[PDB]
Amino acid sequence: PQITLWKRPLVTIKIGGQLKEALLDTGADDTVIEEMSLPGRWKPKMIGGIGGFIKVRQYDQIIIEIAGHKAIGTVLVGPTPVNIIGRNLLTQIGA
């Protein structure tokens, strides 16, 4: 089975005690989470640039739990299929 590597189990994150599945993407500078409802204040955000033009919402005061570690920062929310993590969180963990 060398052709395919079993690789250790995937990775999950805990937001408010909720279990979610997300993939790591070093190519993503920021983090985007599929559309969902969350408690607390929210703000409308728009994206354009090149190849973009959709309205999304974001949260600027939420806490994320990773590998039993607490972290506070901005967490952009969009209609993306699932959740994707960018360098913002990847580097947050440190080395």
Domain boundaries, the chain: 1-95
The alpha carbon of 32 is separated from its chain's Cα centroid by a whole number of angstroms, namely 5
DSSP E strands, the chain: 12-15, 18-24, 32-33, 43-47, 54-66, 69-77, 83-85
The alpha carbon of 5 is separated from its chain's Cα centroid by a whole number of angstroms, namely 26
The question of whether 25 is a catalytic residue gets the answer yes
Residue from 25, 29, 30, 60 carrying the catalytic annotation: 25
Asked if the 1-95 domain carries CATH number 2.40.70.10, the reply is yes
The amino acid that residue 47 corresponds to is I
- Cα–Cα dist 45/58, whole Å: 6
- Count how many Cα atoms sit within 13 Å of the Cα of residue 92 in the half-sphere of its side chain: 20
Q: Are 32 and 77 in contact (CB under 8 A)?
A: yes
Nearest to 76 by CA among 43, 51, 50: 43
